[PDB]
Structure formats: structure tokens, C-alpha cells
């Protein structure tokens with residue numbers, strides 16, 4: 001037993017990370033088959049970033065202008081194109097370590113692992129959630145752009161995130177692998193506030209089920225609630241609405257523990273109204289919301305890849 | 306910016322994980338060059354575990370009793386021996402993906418990454434600290450034995466932990482890679498309880514420095530204290546005494562932030578005596594002690610491997 005924030009093993013993604021240099025800017029790229037994907041803002045000078053026209057900037061670049069390095073071997077660039085906010089550099093060599101993969105656009109509240117890289121080399125791996133306001137709370141420094149987020153499922157890597165920027169508030173913003181930003185953000189140096197964030201209710205409930213599975217039960221009570229009355233309480237604590245879809249997704253955990261979803265909702269209602277009274281849950285003094293129901297089952301059942 | 310519990314990239318270790326089966330017991334092994342290392346209790350039956358004579362049990366085994374599988378490839382066992390609580394199975398094929406490595410015995414309060422595996426396949430990666438009572442708070446299920454903990458340093462994987470068991474209290478125990486348990490534990494089914502734990506003071510200070518580096522400053526006060534006056538409070542809150550060596554280890558973080566260690570100690574003293582004033586630090590409502598000073602530097606400087 002035990003319950004930890006757990007990242008996916010990173011080796012399959014490590015084998016895809018390369019370094020991309022344009023001008024004096026170096027960041028990371030993702031090498032799948034004979035394409036390297038990276039943020040298009042690699043083509044911008046500091047001056048360009050103030051007001052970039054990416055089509056015109058890309059017109060002015062040659063293939064030679066992009067230095068791509070896999071470890072210490074140069075990969076010759078033979079084409080360059082743009083898809084939304086992502087640059088695609090066609091190279092003359094397909095990556096023999098390309099895993100089975102998909103590009104997916106994830107939902108707010110869903111989790112993924114980030115392989116933080118610099119100069120094409122991995123620094124570390126950690127688990128992130130896509131916040132309801134479409135930012136992520138990561139750990140990213142200069143040079144981290146092009147690091148990716150991903151899930152693994154039976155040796156298929158589903159890439160869902162590529163890192164582009166840090167907002168002045170200290171949260172992080174990026175795109176899917178088709179280059180569409182998550183949230184209302186743009187790759188130009190202009191004002192772009194993130195919306196007000198909220199707590200991911202279905203994930204908090206999943207984590208309470210994880211706690212029960214690991215023997216923490218003190219917060220269970222004998223109260224009941226309807227979905228509507230629970231949501232009326234949770235709205236006042238800046239929790240996202242819980243829908244019947246969320247109730248159904250919590251079905252397997254509810255079935256294993258014998259605790260009906262709405263009874264766990266009554267427990268959560270009491271936790272919100274009363275606090276923890278100096279107690280902790282799974283070693284935490286806050287209600288945690290970055291585990292999905294599937295993350296609970298995946299950790300507690302030993303799923304491998 | 307941002308500060309997360311960050312594991313090492315796991316690919317170098319993933320390439321060393323195998324499955325070892327003896328009788329009807331399956332667990333994981335670590336394949337380095339032509340030797341597979343795994344917990345010796347793999348040779349015990351359920352009746353053996355009650356009172357195992359490991360020397361006798363090993364003499365009664367032959368090479369054919371061990372089935373070793375590296376992914377889809379069966380590895381032929383050509384020798385077997387025992388070093389303390391670790392079994393060493395010599396195989397007729399050397400692992401071509403063996404990283405440059407060392408076996409290290411870590412000190413309490415130091416951290417490492419765990420690659421949790423089942424049936425020789427990686428499930429997830431997460432950071433652990435060796436607690437002062439020589440347990441770790443991990444996430445391990447049936448079949449996780451033989452999963453390893455490690456650090457990566459420049460060009461070398463330093464393996465420091467192999468997983469053997471879960472205490473009835475829900476914490477985890479294991480050995481170094483020479484087969485010596487951390488703490489007073491033994492690989493037999495007899496009563497064993499962890500000693501009372503304590504909080505790793507130098508790590509809490511390191512994490513407060515991480516908070517300052519990331520813009521959290523609310524807990525800083527203009528006060529300073531002495532090492533002795535701080536240790537008076539530390540003893541009252543089950544914190545380890547702070548030594549001059551531990552002050553020295555905090556030197557680089559103190560230097561970067563311009564906050565003397567004893568000033569931060571005055572801040573920590575006020576936090577211990579008065580609480581966290583309804584605030585969080587780096588998203589936590591509790592003081593965190595599982596980041597070493599070097600973990601802070603590694604994450605905040607983007608060290609790669």
C-alpha cells in the first residue's frame with residue numbers, strides 16, 4: 001500500500017528528446033519518425049517577440065538555420081513548416097526509438113507526466129494536472145520550452161502537452177502537439193490573464209477513495225446528500241460542479257470500497273464545512289485534487305507499461 | 306519558476322529491470338552486466354518465510370529453479386549466490402544497456418528516486434527520503450519487491466535501495482544493493498516495528514530556501530537566532546538538532562538568497578511556534594522535509610543527465 005504522486009516511467013520519451021537551436025535560442029524538440037516538433041517561438045529574436053508575424057518570420061528561415069542535435073549527433077533539417085503554434089522540422093533520419101504514440105488534447109482536470117528537459121537532455125519527471133483555467137503548476141526554467149507532457153497506456157505514449165511559457169504569476173502555459181494553446185494564451189509578449197481557477201472536485205473524491213483504500217477512514221460519516229445539494233455547498237468553496245458523468249467515473253472505486261459516491265460527497269461536504277480538525281489525509285493537511293479516478297486505480301492495482 | 310517533487314529520469318534504470326521467478330513467487334531483479342540482483346526471499350515458500358534457513362534453502366536450489374525474463378527474452382541462469390539479503394544470479398548474457406553505475410549506502414535524510422515495477426515492467430517513478438527511522442514512505446504492492454531506488458550524478462547511476470517488504474504499519478523497508486537492510490529489519494516473518502520518526506531539519510530549511518527562490522517570502526522575519534536557541538525549539542517539536550555541518554551544507558542556498566541560515570532558522574522557529582497563519586508554502590499546508598539542499602539546487606538550476 002501507500003499513495004504517492006507518481007509519474008510515468010520516462011524512458012520512451014527520453015529516447016525522443018532532441019535539442020533545437022535557431023539563432024542564439026536553444027530549446028527542446030520531440031523527434032518522432034522523421035519530424036522534430038518544437039515551439040514556433042524558437043524562430044523569434046527578443047525584438048521579434050514584441051510583435052511577431054510568424055508566417056513572415058518563417059519565410060525568412062532556411063533549413064540550415066535550424067541546428068537539431070540528438071545527443072551529440074546532428075540531424076540534418078530538410079524541411080520546415082508550421083502547424084498553429086508548433087514548428088515541424090523534417091529531418092533526414094527517422095528516429096529508431098519512436099514509440100507507438102498518439103497526439104491527444106486533454107481535458108481540464110486530467111493528469112499527465114512532464115519530462116523537464118534542457119538542451120535536449122532530461123532533468124526530471126513529475127506529475128501535473130491541467131487546471132480548470134488551462135494552466136499547469138509545473139517546474140520550468142529558461143531553456144525548458146519544448147519539454148512535453150504525456151500519458152502511457154500499454155506501451156502507447158499519448159503526448160498531450162508541449163511547454164511554451166511561464167505567465168508572470170508563475171504558472172505555466174503551452175499547447176497540444178497540434179500547436180493549439182490550452183486556454184486563452186498566445187505566443188506574443190502581450191497581456192493575457194489566466195482565468196480564475198477552481199478545485200477539481202471529482203479528483204478530490206478520487207483521492208478520498210485512495211485514502212480509504214489505504215486505511216484512512218476518519219472522515220467517513222453516515223450523512224447523505226443529493227448531487228444538487230452537494231454542488232450547492234461545493235460552489236461556495238470554489239469547487240467545480242460534479243456531474244453524473246463524474247459520479248459514473250467514480251463507480252469502480254465506490255464499488256470496491258462499498259462507499260456510495262454520494263456518501264463520499266457527504267464526507268467531502270463535511271470536510272469543506274468543518275475542516276480537518278488538525279488531522280491529515282494520506283499525510284496531507286489539504287484536500288488534494290491532482291489525482292484522477294484512473295490514477296487511483298492505476299497506482300493501487302500496479303498497472304505497468 | 307515552480308517547485309515540484311521531481312524524480313530522476315528513469316530510462317537508464319528501466320533498461321535494467323527484469324522479472325525473476327522461483328517456484329510460484331515472482332518479483333523484480335536488476336540486471337547489470339552479467340548479474341541479476343534481487344531479494345533473496347524469492348527462494349522462500351510461505352512456510353519457509355516463517356523461519357527461513359537461507360543458507361540451506363540456497364544450497365537446495367539449482368540454476369534451473371530460477372526463471373529470469375528481460376522483457377520477452379529469457380535469460381539463462383548459469384550461477385547463483387547470496388550476499389547478505391540479496392541473491393545474485395549470474396546469467397550467460399551481459400546487459401548491453403548497463404549504465405555506468407555504483408552501489409551506494411545512503412544516509413538517513415537523503416533522497417532517491419524509486420522506479421516501482423511489477424513483473425519486470427516499470428509502473429511509475431517517485432521521490433522518497435530515507436527516514437531517520439530507516440523506513441521510506443513509498444507506494445508498493447504485491448510483486449513490487451526488487452524495485453530499486455537510485456540517484457543520477459553526472460554520468461553515473463548510484464543504486465541505493467532495493468525493496469523487500471511493507472511493515473504492518475504501512476511503511477516500507479529494504480536493503481542497499483549489497484543486501485544490508487536499512488534499519489534493524491530482517492527478511493523473516495517476525496515482529497518488527499519502526500522506531501519513532503523525527504523531522505529532517507536541514508531539509509525543511511532547504512525547502513524554505515526553495516520557497517524564497519520561487520517568490521514566497523511571507524514567512525521571512527527580520528530576526529536571527531543562535532544555533533543553540535534554535536535547537537531548544539527544535540527539540541520541542543521533534544525536529545533533529547541542527548549541526549554546523551548542516552549549516553555548511555545550506556551555504557549555497559543561503560548565498561544565493563542572501564538569507565543567513567540562522568535568519569532562516571528564526572523564521573522556522575516562528576513557524577513552529579505559531580503555525581502557518583492560514584498560508585501555504587509552495588502549495589503545502591505543512592512543512593516539508595523530503596527535499597535535500599542538493600535536490601533544491603538540482604531542480605532550481607536545471608541539472609541534466
Ligand code: NA
Nearest residue numbers: 526528568571
Ligand atoms: Na529571520
